[model samples]
Target: KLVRLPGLIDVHVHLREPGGTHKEDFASGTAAALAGGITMVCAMPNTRPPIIDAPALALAQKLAEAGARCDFALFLGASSENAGTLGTVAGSAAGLKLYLNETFSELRLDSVVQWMEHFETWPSHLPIVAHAEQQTVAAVLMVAQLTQRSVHICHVARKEEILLIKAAKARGLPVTCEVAPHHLFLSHDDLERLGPGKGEVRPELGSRQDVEALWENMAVIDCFASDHAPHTLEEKCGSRPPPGFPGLETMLPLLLTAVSEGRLSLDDLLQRLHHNPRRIFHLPPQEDTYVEVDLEHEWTIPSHMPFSKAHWTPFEGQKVKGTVRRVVLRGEVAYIDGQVLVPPGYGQDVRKWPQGAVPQLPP
Candidate 1:
């Protein structure tokens, strides 16, 4: 009998299309999503061409329809140049995205009011997703003040910042947070063992206690996104480059290990990975098949083969029990017994059919 669990959802990822096709593309990215058991993966719009405006985002939307390999959606980045363009793309964009902090030591507040004012022009209310960090604090604070509860946070990777996000939720401010697998399972100690591969993502693996605390509040986390950031091994080495690790293929394996260890409930994992993203993004909901895990499948991660170009992971060689029997995407068996059975080119864009009126950003 094939053990099946509800298919997974991944809300944050960069497919490197439209600009840097050499790194990754829609087809490969979605194929990797399948290997990780995700039925849906939302792509961030920070590509080479930058899905920053109507045309760029529309291009993603069109590609999602024509060639996207899995259930796909796009997040539109709000930049200073395209701050005035939100209303034009509101029809297709999943939400407004903010890179509040600096990348490469560059602060990009972009335009504060222009992006915030989007709440006023959109016919339907569209939530804004903020990449909140130490510096973006005041920027998002301004969003809270101006947008009136239409903002959400992505990947609360910092252990110290959990309290900050929790505080926002407690205030009934409509704020939400997501935790990534790297931030949840592996920690700084692994950083010592794995070194640079795991150091690419920010907040560089909190203490072990931090990981535990995050799992303790797994219910409170709105959802979990893989943040499936991929970089060549060469790019990951060194003290100066941006820190990140690949989890698109290993996210479920790590989470299933947590389930087997009694750290989190299987049902909760389903909700975090499947149910929540649909509700959060207003995507269409569909039942997925899941392979029932033996819960006792013990094995070490194979470092040699991964579906992604980036093969670095801190969890490599670590022993863990629990296995994904298979995956059902939209009621079809997509993965079975650690093997993907879905036909090539079978995954399709599933973002359509959501007809909910877009939320108008508050004036």
Candidate 2:
């Protein structure tokens, strides 16, 4: 029987355009998104040249408009010196991406004081999506308390980080956080199994206890994002393996396997993957978008998936249940039974609401 799902949306993805196209680009990345059942993605801005100002934002939008296969919204990165520019262009981006550590971008806010100072300058309505570790998340919560501006923590990997976010949410601090699939499904030990390049990831995989805490406290985890950072196999195997793994194609299948095993409920899966993201981001629903899955189907994730140029996945050779039978994007069939039916440039911007608009839960 067919299981229908709201078209999935991933708010945290690095399309790697403008500079790291060798890793991934809008066309290839979004195509991978469709194959994995994502109809929309929010592209991060840490590529070459970086999207720090209005012009850069415009250029990224222009490129996405001309090349994306699925709907997208681009985020503008925030630097210590570009608060004015971020405020001026807050309306154009999905939200501001704050790099708390030195990750692939030159615009890292290394100090808590510096992060707070920049937070004070940003428009309170716009969400500040932070790339932070446990300490950085602790500082972000403190600033959110002082400023009362909500922060969305990206790629949360630590048990301590989850505790902080849970406490903040309990205090009604407007704090939200996402757990990447890798952090949930894989751990540091997987490094030995997958090797350095495949196992390497930012915030690094945590201990088995950390992964267990993520599931045990699933109620506090707001959503699941792939953190789909694609890196070439050569780049991953080079002297320094970049900390990222391909997930755009594996996120759903892995999670679906969890659902099949009764570890997660289907309702919770939809809430995290579709509803909560649209609500938190103030995105309007695409009534025509949805995915058809065969609930009983079980298949292995292939080693040579072509939707992403990266051509490798951490879940290579893993078996999964609930295969995506078809993907319909905004009334059009985009992918069906192992084939991409739509070409690039069909995706449109889906940032319909203004920054800070409180999202109502989907009924």
Candidate 3:
């Protein structure tokens, strides 16, 4: 009998398409997501027109549906020029997508309070998500205080801030945060190996002490998001490059190795990557699902097997054991043994949260 846990939900990812096809597109990105055992992904709508309005959002949904391998949702933006349009976008989109500080530059902190007030009134339970960093924390929190509603924060790159976010959650605030595997496993010391890797996000990496803090707070955080922002080596090493790392293909392997190394328990792994995202984001339960990996299995890292268009990864050469033997998405074998099976459209959207009752808090 195959025991299945719900598949992963990556709350933050940039599958740049409709404009930057040379970098990545929906097809390549979703393919990477499936290989990572993710069932659904909520993509940032910073495309050509920006999915901050109804027409643009609908178009994005159509395009993604046409090419997406896994189920995906669109996160519309709250921009200055399009302030009037936020009311329209928030009515249909997932949440108010904020740049927070100046990182993405669509939504700034100076006008964030007004934006939050706008989203709070949205009829749909659309939660605001921020691409957060140390530079933006002050501005991010200035808006965070306005909500009794759930606010989903993303790309949390540091460990000390993990304590701060937990403090907010402990205060009975409706705040759910996400952390990537890179931030959890590697610290600033990793710069020695792969400095300024394209997948490295803003506010930079943390220290060993910061990584330790991340481990301690694993019990409280909501989701293990991949933050799968892919960029080519030429683009990453160019004179001007973005600070983020490609993680979708390698996220599970790194965590599975951590399990083998006695750093994290299997139950804890299921909670962080599986259960937490579904409960926090109000996604449907895939009760008929489970993941399989032989605890005694061992393997060497493969160089070119990653399905992502970005051919490189931070975990380039690491001896790892305990592979994901199989990942069945709701009774359908999405990933069997060592290979991905479903082409596309087999993964379904799971956003319908069971209503009529409040969920008990995790103790």
Candidate 4:
């Protein structure tokens, strides 16, 4: 018999559409998500056209409605020039994504001063999720203090970043953060084993010490996101390999393995994957949504999986425990015994919390 668990909700993913369909699109992206036990995912706004304005947001919604296999929410990429557009798309966007530090995308504020100024204009009620490195994370926290608005740091990978977030939370500045599965599972040591391009990821994988620190301070880490960026094997191994590794299909299994090894408890895993994301993003609870896992089963991750257009994975050939057996979304069976039962468009839009309302955790 399969054991049931709450379906996962990944808050950060890149479903390349309206421009980079050659990489991934809503249909394939969401299907891969379902196959991995994720019932809902929040799509990031760095697509080819980018979701920086009203039209782009509408286009993303239209695309997801036409081809999504799981519930979806979208974030509006924030830039200094897009300040005026925030209000226009606030109702539709899950949150505003700010690239505080440069990475795969060129969307970033020019300086700390500019970031602070922009922070002042941001809608206080909505979360300002940031892609910040160590120094940049400090600047973000400083500005968040100045503006007195909440900030959610994305894909934290270093010990210093985690400590900074911990201090900020202690001060009660309304700061929250997420850790990607790769950062938690893989370290610099694995880079050599996986080869140069295969293990590359932005915020690059942390040192083994850094990774251990993250686990030691798991209580402060708000949620776990897949950061499910994908690229073909050809693209990954090309002259200039793009950063990021596929995670939606491997995130849950890897974490479950950690549990079996006594690295983290099942209750902690549930908080990171379910309760925390739902509370932070104000997602409505789906009493009927869940996934059944065969914990006793052991398997190895294959190089490529269906649904996602990307044809390679960083965790290829790695043994993992607790395979997903079925997935249910919104009271309907979406995936079962390795087969998808629903087609695209079965997913509905996720709702955003009202402006200025804080999501309180249950006692």
TM-score of each model, paired residue for residue: 0.87, 0.95, 0.85, 0.94
lDDT of 3 at 181: 81
| Cα TM-score of candidate 4 | 0.94
Worst 10 residues of 4 by lDDT: 352-361
Q: What is the lDDT of candidate 1?
A: 0.68
Q: lDDT of each prediction vs. the true structure?
A: 0.68, 0.85, 0.67, 0.84
Span of 10 residues, lowest total lDDT, candidate 1 = 101-110
lDDT of 1 by residue, 1-363 (tens): 334666677888877777656556776677677777777778887776788777777677766665455677788776666555577556566677777665521125556665465544443366677777754654676667675655667877665567666766677767677888888877777766776544657645788888877877675698888887766666677555555566777787778888867787888888888778777777665544443555677789887335666656656887777666656776676665646666545655554544433444665
lDDT of 4 by residue, 220-314 (tens): 89899999998878888889888888888888899988898999898998999889988787776665899998888898888787667888887
lDDT of 3: 0.67
Q: Say which prediction, candidate 3 or candidate 4, comes out ahead on TM-score.
A: 4
Ranking by TM-score: 2, 4, 1, 3
Off by over 4 Å in 2: 352-363
Q: What is every candidate's alpha-carbon RMSD to the true fold? A: 3.2, 3.1, 4.2, 3.1
Model 1 RMSD in angstroms? 3.2
> If both were scored by lDDT, which would come out higher, candidate 2 or candidate 3?
2
Runs in model 4 with CA error above 4 Å?
Answer: 352-363
Best by lDDT: 2
